[PDB]
């Protein structure tokens, strides 16, 4: 592993220092349908004219980005995305901007969000959960080795591809950082205690979030929930977790070590780093090399009927893309 990661860090660094810009333009794509909306922008299914390929195009209204003070975050998202390269990471193909918007064109993952399948089916069996978990583990091992923190793990940001494997999307809150950071950002149910308590945090938060994900997948609901975010923070800070009867002994053991309020004891943040997790009982039957190579038998494979099929995504109110005649926020987004 240390042999492989070393080569990855090199390609990453070259692109991190000298990012690509303006690799396409709006008129090369035919907008088809919205695949999803977010606190920030919308993602549409588009078709590239010259090639005929489908892509998912994320659209960001510059003015909205500014109002919400997400300038630096948007710049991180684009800079990081265009530099990373991993099997379980969504791939950025092109990126550009016009007078009103910022655009990121990625590979289209037609399998739908893990969110929809998880909520339709109820919950995933442990072997099923483990399959997904393993992919996130390797993914976090890659990201963290480059000094990156994800900060927004959740089923809504995980896509299922044609082979049944995961593709992590949305690097909205991703940040390259050595040492600690302080931004209060993420989704309430997934926030680590360090965040809520405003004490400065590191990579460790991603590991806690993995704990919430695994729990949500196996139980069918998150470990901490309520009707208002404030009530949720109280639960997370107390550290009181209750497990479903059907949860195996091994799973409960892993979880207790990931949902550990004391970041000096939290798995992933100890001396052996990612190995405490990989070597844990719950993952004993997991062949790590097999999953990285995608040679494993996917437990669930979504049904898609040809290219362009959006049947695995919910329908959304279509909204017309507006391009002002005047350039908006030119200086702020120069490097984009």
């Amino acid at each position: 592993v240390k042999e492989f990661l070393a080569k990855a860090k090199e390609d990453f660094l070259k692109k991190w220092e000298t990012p690509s810009q303006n690799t396409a333009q709006l008129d090369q794509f035919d907008r088809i349908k919205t695949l999803g909306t977010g606190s920030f922008g919308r993602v549409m299914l588009v078709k590239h004219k010259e090639s005929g390929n489908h892509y998912a195009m994320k659209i960001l209204d510059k003015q909205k980005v500014v109002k919400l003070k997400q300038i630096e975050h948007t710049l991180n998202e684009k800079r990081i995305l265009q530099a990373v390269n991993f099997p379980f990471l969504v791939k950025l193909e092109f990126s550009f901007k016009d007078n009103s918007n910022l655009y990121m064109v990625m590979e289209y993952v037609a399998g739908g969000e893990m969110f929809s399948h998880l909520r339709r089916i109820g919950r995933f069996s442990e072997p099923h959960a483990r399959f997904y978990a393993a992919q996130i583990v390797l993914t976090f091992e890659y990201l963290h080795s480059l000094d990156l923190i994800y900060r927004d793990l959740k089923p809504e940001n995980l896509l299922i591809d044609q082979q049944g494997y995961i593709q992590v999307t949305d690097f909205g809150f991703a940040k390259r950082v050595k040492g600690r950071t302080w931004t209060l950002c993420g989704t309430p149910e997934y926030l680590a205690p360090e965040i809520i308590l405003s004490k400065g945090y590191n990579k460790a938060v991603d590991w806690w979030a993995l704990g919430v994900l695994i729990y949500e997948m196996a139980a069918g609901y998150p470990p901490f929930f309520a009707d208002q975010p404030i009530q949720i923070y109280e639960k997370i800070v107390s550290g009181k977790v209750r497990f479903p009867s059907h949860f195996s002994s091994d799973l409960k053991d892993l979880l207790r070590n990931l949902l550990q309020v004391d970041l000096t004891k939290r798995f992933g943040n100890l001396k052996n780093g990612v190995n405490d997790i990989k070597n844990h009982k719950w993952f004993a039957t997991t062949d790590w090399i097999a999953i990285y190579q995608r040679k494993v038998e996917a437990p669930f494979i979504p049904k898609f009927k040809g290219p362009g099929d959006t049947s695995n995504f919910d329908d959304y109110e279509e909204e017309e893309i507006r391009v002002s005649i005047n350039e908006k926020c030119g200086k702020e987004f120069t490097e984009f």
């Binding site: 909205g172 950002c185 069918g220 009707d227």
Partner: peptide
């Protein structure tokens, strides 16, 4: 049950981020 309490809460749909 916990499941019934979850399904009755107002947070079963797509959850949005919280920011600075």
């Amino acid at each position: 049950t916990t499941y019934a309490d979850f399904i009755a809460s107002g947070r079963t749909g797509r959850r949005n981020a919280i920011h600075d």
